[PDB]
From a paper:
Trimeric capsomers of the VACV [name] protein form a transitory, stabilizing lattice on the surface of the initial spherical immature virus particle. The crystal structure of [name] reveals that this major scaffolding protein comprises a double β barrel “jelly-roll” subunit arranged as pseudo-hexagonal trimers. The [name] lattice seems to act as a mechanical scaffold for the growing crescent membrane of the IV with sufficient rigidity to maintain a constant radius of curvature of the crescents even before they close to form complete spheres (Chlanda et al., 2009; Heuser, 2005), thereby fixing the size of the immature virion.
A mutant of [name] with a single amino acid change from aspartic acid to glycine at position 513 (D13D513G) polymerizes into flat sheets of protein composed of hexagonal lattices (Szajner et al., 2005), which do not associate with membrane bilayers but form layered stacks (Szajner et al., 2005), and irregular membranes are formed that lack a [name] scaffold, similar to those seen when the expression of [name] is repressed. The structure of D13D513G was solved by SAD analysis of SeMet-labeled protein crystals, and refined to 3.0 Å resolution with residuals R/Rfree = 0.170/0.203. For the structure of D13D513G at 3.0 Å, density has been attributed to residues Asn2 to Ile10 and modeled (no density is observed between Ile10 and Ser15). Overall the D13D513G mutant is almost identical to the wild-type protein (0.3 Å root-mean-square deviation [rmsd] over 533 Cα atoms). The D513G mutation lies in the H2-I2 loop and the glycine introduces a degree of flexibility to the loop, which adopts three slightly different conformations in the subunits of the D13D513G trimer. The mutated residue, 513 lies in a solvent-accessible position on the outside of the trimer. The orientation of the trimers within the PRD1-derived lattice matches the electron microscopy data and the morphology-modifying residue 513 lies at the interface between neighboring trimers. In addition, the mutant structure contains well-resolved electron density for residues 2–10 at the N terminus of the protein (not observed in the wild-type structure), which form a short α helix that precedes the long N-terminal tail of each subunit. D13D513G and wild-type [name] trimers differ only in the additional short N-terminal helix (residues 2–10) visualized in the structure of D13D513G. This “hook” projects upward from the trimer base and is wedged between the V1 and V2 jelly-rolls of the other two adjacent subunits in the trimer, contributing an extra 1152 Å2 of buried surface area to that subunit interface. In addition to these electrostatic characteristics, the somewhat separate amphipathic N-terminal helix of [name] (residues 2–10, seen in the D13D513G structure) may also stabilize interaction with the membrane by more direct contacts.
Residue numbers in the entry:
A (entry chain B), B (entry chain A), C (entry chain C): 2 to 10, 15 to 547
Write the structure that this text describes.
């Protein structure tokens, strides 16, 4: 061993075993919490909370956390909050000064920036207590107990802590939070008295931040990135963000538009949010009408329903599709029935039929004489996240030549209103990639084009995220310590804008998901200079 | 595309594409492992392992890892290790030189610092193999096979690798590990011969660390943070840490005190540690006594037990509560019975009753003729984490007007001794927040006060942790490269101390968990200067 | 509160609230994707894709991503891709210039470097769509739909983004990807027409990278680490990497060699890759032959099979082992049977026996008259990851004194060919540590020796990984900004090499897994200097 030590044993070297331990600026942090001023004026009387931060001792601040006291939900229907309820109820956030807006973000973009922060996401409300679809039995029954959720309003001032902090520069800072209508953050059946709930519900907010009391602060200018959103017209595959002079990134995604529907869906998995969870919740809801053990032909189904007695061999053939169903402990007086067309969709009477019953291979279970119901054991099916994301209105579409919804009255009563504001793609999990081509143009010249989502793969790799978006990043320079790298305009050559064009993929004219309306969302991060001369001021880089 | 590359094309610029690649200090790392010296003197003859580090070539060190050789557990009872068994058996760790203690930590605080390190936590012993509750059948049977567990003793010397490393100078460094009783790290039934196990069990430790052999080390002074904790009096909502002169943080949490009990609990979920897992383990244990299938009235239950035959409609009414129990394949000669008061608690006769049977709404299952038992299918219940965290001693408490434990002898035999040293709150998962208010005072002046756990929300956000504590951090300055920012005393004004006052929520005099004793835990991180002049020396900042 | 802000209120201090915001090098990033040139000119017509990056505008590059287009798999057998299919089909990657190879890696080492990057791993092909063992029913049936996977080729140029980027000193850079045969990345039964699949399968690659267009680049030299591996002779417990002059790390692991077998295994868990998942998949496959309900003695099993009728008390004794099997709803004309020796191994008659039936304690379930099969409720067993990792060839081994595979013809038909190239250890999860002692020698001198895998514990702790390897790291100096610390050679003493010796564990008294052939793997990271005098050049540090 000693011979290797002697093999170890003159150049100028950097000390990697000691540090010169520099003394920082003298400061003292403090967690400050303020109650706001609530306003409900004009646009559908929307809720706006205003917080004024004016202190001679608060020199700088960062890490904004908005808390919300959710009330006790009493009643008789089925009710649950959407996952991350705290983020979903934020429509817009705006930080301002005497000189105007310093930074502002749309609710969905704040969520998108925090999507990879599991801690922040939990805090906003991701619990079985909140997200499970609870049931009221009596008019005085408690559906949900009161709860407090915490929303981390991630800002550019948190990146490098004290270094990136917002300096107040002897000015009043006003944080303004615009809320989404409570209908958005709630999942309910028709049975629930939403009318009374909507009237009585009030957002109860409190803004908290980390304040810094700094002795002899030496302020210098900085740069900030402001996200700017462009939502295209319904089913328009283009968006243009004008006046692009110094952008650090460009993000592209799609959103479904459910305005052509009642926002009612057959099932929701609640707290369990995996792709398998959405599917299982759906299959579970259909099974009660799909396999019926009755004496004799089942009653209470539309005349359009084709309920067939299962043969001795257990195989029911629905055209090309074969469904094997074998139920144990069936009474001698009863028979096993299969609903041959629970949900079906067709463009013409001679067209291809999209039938949900055809999506089942094998159904096995045991009948309970005690509870007079079937307890399914093993199911073989080809159901997917797209089926679970079909608004019930699209099965009943004018475009559908058949009845479409052949379920029982009971099943239809259990349908849920889902108005989740932050849905992407055409499914609840944004699994299906509906973009075949992406084309970005700086002016009239093609800046980037792709077929596969390589820009999404890079976005996920570079940010270590499981939920990325097709993103072009122009800045690979360290934040705060350097002026960000940007795509830079040439007004003379008319390179004032970024135009995005997509080429969507298609399904059969016979799949209800074909009729889901899409909107293209383009997000641009513009570079701004922060000056602290006469209070806090921001200037667009040009 | 070329017009955009021409749109890209004199200011002083920082090179972001090249680096000057500076030569570091000449060193050679080495993984060194040492066997210690075991001592069992004085306080209940507690186990203390001592490791002496001194090598003409070891210049500096970091990343301490304690290996523990767990023996083969042979015998007849039910036995399991606590999750993260390696951390749980550490009572205290102390690094010291000829000049005295350099750094020391209480076992629970070392665990708290490593709670967000999933890798370190797995290494300490978190598996099906160690943490499941295993069963012995013969006196020579193997309950547990031998295993090695690795405990990462996180120190302030690992933060910035070689830069933050502990320099040994020429002094002898002594690492001293104080071990908790084996009783603490084991979960067992009464059937297990713990008496023989306790006598025969010996901690078998080995300390490993990364040692650096540095040629011509140039040592400079440093700063280190030392955690200091104060445990309040049983049930007292106050604690004070005296002599606070330069603290970087203050943390507040509570701990249950189970000294007033036998430390016996009805159930443990083993390796599965989710809130649902604790609850499911509990429900599973109760169900065997809760719904009985017998010919006729069930036998072998206390006279105080009220077992009722389930009516034809399947609904059994226990006062206000309605329990629906429908079991399939019941023999013709037998009936279904419900235990109306399995577990009961009352402080007064003909007054409020905490009844565990009332916590069930629906119970379905099928009777097995082959194994003469019920295989429960679906259970609707309101059992919580608190219920699963009630010691069984409290159900039998002298406060209790009722017998309380109306379970079978068989059920009671399956109860488990749990002595896990690192339990927080009043439940096994520290879910229930028992602090309504927190008030911190620097001297006589209020430094901070809160109602909601905002300080915990910030602690979780700032440290990216799922298991935070109400913490006030005063240092937001980068570690190692800067002198930490601290709350600084003014002895003249009497600002020598930090006094914590909480306000506890209450469960109610008729809830068995009301009788769980609490302890306030206040943790203060004091700033210290490290000098390497005459061996390693530390000096408290004042 | 104000008295504490006055308690806050001259030394030179570092500004922690402002930054001088330095302007970076003027650049513009771009995501570039190129189609390659496919070659199959030996050794065994192995597929080699070549990508040439020659651009007057591309100054530097990093973040290489290989996309592969997987075709539609049509046919009749059972087929599934291996988890992380994208990484598994890479045999070798080589980046080179006019001056030769700059950096190259063996496919397994690229995977090992990316094993802790969950995002990259998902992208390469980890999904129920890709990894589930799918079934074809007709010769025209679609087993797998077409899919695209993305393989992140992690290089030393991504570490510090633009700073660590590969500069192209106006030279053509050629990326060369060598592909493993498609057999390696596929899991199939005998029924599948692999012959036609292998003929028709073609790798369809596309290389993507982040190019940087830099104005007035100021290039400086750098250092790079190149992984180099040596695979020992079959069952030889030693390996030696020659010409070691400046290594930053040394890694040691073993690989099973399944060449002495048909690469057929009884079960695979598909997408579900937990240790429990592998075990459950295995137990599920054995159960159909383990507990038989027939009239009367079961038929279609080898004469060597010992199938016993389960007694009234339900307990069947297989020597020391007791198996309790209780099946419900068994017809009056039928009996319950237990296969006493489903799989048995021995190298000597009337000596030790490894019997898989003996690894079961209890088996319960209910017979379905409807599907004429047993639905197993609860199983008590002692089956582990090793048992699921034993090739069927070892049961049929010449050394085996018994028949070995006493399963039904049906069971044997469901066996799967697994040729996963990146298997470590002797089990599918590399859980079992088969090294009792490790000894590393730099020349003739012992550099390091250990018994337990402390080097693996440190590797996992230091890199924050769940799947580490026994690794000695010599560099603890920050990458890019410093010349890496290395173990240095002394050619005179013959310290030119690193010689590793291992003592494999006996793996138990009579385990078939002891006859799985092992290959000791040693990986060395050699330090290379990157120079740009004329084009891009590398030089091995000596």
């Amino acid at each position: 061993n000693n011979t290797i030590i002697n093999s170890l044993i003159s150049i100028k070297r950097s000390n990697v075993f000691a540090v010169d331990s520099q003394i920082p600026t003298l400061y003292m942090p403090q967690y400050i919490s303020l109650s706001g001023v609530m306003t409900n004026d004009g646009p559908d009387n929307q809720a706006i909370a205003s917080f004024e931060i004016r202190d001679q001792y608060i020199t700088a601040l960062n890490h904004l956390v908005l808390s919300l006291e959710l009330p006790e939900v009493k009643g008789m229907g089925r009710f649950g909050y959407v996952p991350y309820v705290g983020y979903k109820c934020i429509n817009h956030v705006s930080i301002s000064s005497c000189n105007g807006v310093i930074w502002e973000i749309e609710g969905e973009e704040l969520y998108n920036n925090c999507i990879n922060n599991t801690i922040a996401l939990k805090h906003s409300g991701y619990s079985s207590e909140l997200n499970d679809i609870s049931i009221g039995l009596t008019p005085n029954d408690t559906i949900k107990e009161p709860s407090t959720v915490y929303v981390y309003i991630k800002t550019p001032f948190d990146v490098e802590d004290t270094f990136s902090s917002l300096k107040l520069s002897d000015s009043k800072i006003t944080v303004t939070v615009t809320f989404n209508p409570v209908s958005d953050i709630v999942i309910r059946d028709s049975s629930f008295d939403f009318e009374t709930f909507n009237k009585e519900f009030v957002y109860v907010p409190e803004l908290s931040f980390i304040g810094y009391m700094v002795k002899n602060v030496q302020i210098k200018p900085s740069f900030i990135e402001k996200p700017r959103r462009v939502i295209g017209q319904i089913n328009q595959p283009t968006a243009t963000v004008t006046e692009v002079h110094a952008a650090t990134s460009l993000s592209v995604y799609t959103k479904p538009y459910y305005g052509n529907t009642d926002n009612k869906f057959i099932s929701y998995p609640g707290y369990s949010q995996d792709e398998k969870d959405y599917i299982d919740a759906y299959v579970s809801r259909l099974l009660d009408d799909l396999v019926i053990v009755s004496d004799g032909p089942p009653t209470g189904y539309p005349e359009s329903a084709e309920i067939v007695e299962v043969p001795e061999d257990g195989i029911v053939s629905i055209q090309d599709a074969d469904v094997y169903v074998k139920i144990d402990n069936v009474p001698d007086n009863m028979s096993v029935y299969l609903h041959t067309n629970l949900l079906m969709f067709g463009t013409r009477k001679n067209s291809f039929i999209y039938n949900i019953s055809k999506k089942f291979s094998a159904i096995t279970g045991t009948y309970s004489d005690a509870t007079k119901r079937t307890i399914f054991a093993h199911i073989s099916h080809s159901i997917n996240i797209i089926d679970t994301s079909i608004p019930v209105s699209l099965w009943t579409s004018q475009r559908n030549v058949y009845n479409g919804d052949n379920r029982s009255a009971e099943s239809k009563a259990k349908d849920l209103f889902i108005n989740d504001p932050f849905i992407k793609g055409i499914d609840f999990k944004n699994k299906t990639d509906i973009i075949s081509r992406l084309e970005v143009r700086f002016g009239n010249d093609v800046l980037y084009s792709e077929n596969g989502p390589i820009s999404r793969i890079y976005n996920e790799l570079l940010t270590k995220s499981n939920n990325g978006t097709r993103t072009l990043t122009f800045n690979f320079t360290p934040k705060i310590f350097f002026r960000p790298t940007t795509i830079t305009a040439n007004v003379s050559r008319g390179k004032d804008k970024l135009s995005v064009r997509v080429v969507y993929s298609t399904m059969g004219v016979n799949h209800p998901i074909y009729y889901v309306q899409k909107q293209l969302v383009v997000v641009c991060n513009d570079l701004y200079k922060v000056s602290y001369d006469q209070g806090v001021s921001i200037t667009k880089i040009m």
